[PDB]
């Protein structure tokens with residue numbers, strides 16, 4: 032029915048589990064107090080590469096049973112970091128395509144992490160043209176950060192671990208950008224324990240997933256959105272939308288202020304260096320609209336999706 | 347390629363997981379010392395109904411259609427008076443539909459009494475195959491029921507393979523699974539599963555030498571059923587492999603180890619005495635296999651071996 036099924040998640044779990052962390056679930060008395068809920072924090076900020084994206088990235092690069100000869104990406108962010116690590120694990124080269132006009136800062140980070148830089152011109156046109164060429168020349172693959180089925184399946188493994196670590200969980204709260212994580216999680220939860228709610232959390236400044244659920248059709252952001260939640264600037268896409276349409280119970284939007292306040296709360300009160308994008312799920316459970324969630328939904332697992340925060344800019 | 351796929355096994359585990367137990371994997375230092383290996387015991391003797399067969403039976407009740415024109419079974423029917431009939435009855439009871447067991451007139455009174463106390467209805471046949479088939483097809487049609495074969499029905503094979511999803515998840519460093527074989531529904535479902543997910547893991551069958559059709563069939567390269575009903579204390583593996591399980595077993599099972607009656611008996615007693623688990627002798631088959639001389643041919647690299655303890659339905663009074 033969908034671009035993945037739970038069988039692809041179980042395959043991904045076998046495929047990646049030797050090479051990723053089974054990240055802990057932590058709790059917070061104060062957050063419980065503040066929300067009225069029993070909260071559980073699935074700590075993907077402690078995952079390899081500092082976000083959950085190594086799960087999709089390793090699943091897409093690695094074959095369970097022409098294997099990729101290289102990986103190529105436009106991402107200098109969590110996706111690119113994840114793809115680079117996965118490539119290194121598989122013994123294959125990783126290429127990041129970066130504008131010539133990119134920060135000098137960021138160039139050095141990439142090569143420190145062990146990717147090879149291929150400079151393009153700042154045009155999207157030129158980025159895509161160079162990526163395609165590098166891909167073809169190296170016989171490599173590009174991995175879509177959210178729409179690739181192997182990526183969506185890899186992300187689903189988050190929910191397998193949560194359902195084992197929190198056996199009486201009533202809901203998962205998942206930040207949504209392109210929806211590969213949300214959609215992998217929804218597939219998994221609805222397959223294994225469909226009474227468990229799946230909720231998305233989204234910046235109201237980037238509210239395409241909410242708009243699409245409201246309208247009943249895929250409505251991507253018209254323009255690049257402006258949000259401190261830099262990891263959820265992607266719109267949902269054609270492979271994640273049908274899953275989220277059918278298997279996600281509700282979408283909670285949160286303001287920029289709510290994201291910032293929730294992020295600071297986690298830093299000061301839980302001492303976890305989450306990135307603001309990971310504060311989106313916390314802000315959702317703190318939000319006014321979340322009070323409409325039934326009192327029967329008590330045990331809520333929020334995915335702290337990443338910790339890759341620029342402490343230089345760390346309001 | 348085969349009568350089931352890994353996708354069918356996952357569908358089965360979604361279908362049955364709210365009603366079966368995720369059985370534990372136990373260990374024993376003593377059996378580790380005796381075998382040279384790192385053993386893991388998948389405890390299907392603690393499953394609902396006392397054997398793994400609830401997996402295939404519940405999957406069949408929740409997935410098979412009686413007819414082109416009716417999507418929901420209105421009853422279940424089988425010729426198995428043993429672990430399969432018990433499991434099928436439980437599965438039917440869960441789904442609120444009646445169970446019928448077709449029973450020879452010649453069956454012991456104790457068999458007839460038990461079937462009825464569990465909550466199945468008995469339908470009598472003549473001991474003849476002709477009669478058994480006639481009666482079961484009659485019952486199946488009259489009741490708008492499904493007939494559920496203990497080992498060759500694809501939905502049953504797919505449900506038994508869920509054991510291997512649990513094992514792989516429970517024992518991430520496992521090197522081999524050892525599985526007792528009779529009709530091979532459990533072996534073939536496990537083989538499909540392990541070979542789709544992590545084919546580097548070996549799949550080994552264990553079989554009584556007194557009922558060695560799966561060994562003879564693998565040896566000859568074609569399906570060779572027992573010519574006569576076998577005599578073995580391993581009563582749950584007296585069926586021969588069949589047309590749906592044989593191709594899977596031929597292609598995806600790495601080796602077959604046969605064990606004598608005395609080896610089955612000694613292994614069963616060893617598990618009772620040294621692990622304090624009430625396995626039925628049939629479930630002692632896989633333990634005997636790993637203790638057997640021929641198992642020493644298994645590479646020393648194959649270190650972490652999970653043996654399925656397939657059932658605990660033992661006649662305590664009879665206990666040979």
Ligand SMILES: O=C(NCc1nc2ccccc2[nH]1)c1ccco1
Pocket residue numbers: 106107108109111112115127137140141142144145146339340
């Ligand atoms: O620049 C970041 N991190 C460092 C980085 N980014 C890479 C990209 C490719 C390979 C290694 C990398 N190392 C960032 C921005 C948003 C989240 O993380």
Ligand SMILES: O=C(NCc1nc2ccccc2[nH]1)c1ccco1
Pocket residue numbers: 259261306307339340341342344345
């Ligand atoms: O840009 C990065 N991460 C996302 C981010 N987004 C922010 C928003 C505000 C403050 C800090 C933030 N950090 C990065 C660079 C190097 C490592 O991570």
Ligand SMILES: O=C(NCc1nc2ccccc2[nH]1)c1ccco1
Pocket residue numbers: 426427428429430431432433435447457460461462464465466581659660
């Ligand atoms: O005699 C046995 N079981 C009793 C039984 N058999 C049933 C069949 C249907 C319903 C309930 C049943 N109860 C046996 C033989 C081998 C293992 O167990």
Ligand SMILES: O=C(NCc1nc2ccccc2[nH]1)c1ccco1
Pocket residue numbers: 460579581626627659660661662664665666
């Ligand atoms: O006959 C039954 N099971 C198989 C069996 N086979 C044996 C052989 C020796 C000792 C115990 C055994 N038990 C049965 C009836 C009721 C429940 O289980």
Ligand SMILES: [Ca+2]
Pocket residue numbers: 207208233234237238239240263264265266267
């Ligand atoms: Ca969005």
Ligand SMILES: [Ca+2]
Pocket residue numbers: 527528553554557558559560583584585586587
């Ligand atoms: Ca046999």
Ligand SMILES: [Mg+2]
Pocket residue numbers: 034269270
């Ligand atoms: Mg599609």
Ligand code: NA
Pocket residue numbers: 052054055077
């Ligand atoms: Na950790």
Ligand code: NA
Pocket residue numbers: 199200201327
């Ligand atoms: Na509950």
Ligand code: NA
Pocket residue numbers: 411412413486491
């Ligand atoms: Na029919």
Ligand code: NA
Pocket residue numbers: 041359511512515
């Ligand atoms: Na599983």
Ligand code: NA
Pocket residue numbers: 519520521
């Ligand atoms: Na190994």
Ligand code: NA
Pocket residue numbers: 349589590
């Ligand atoms: Na067939």
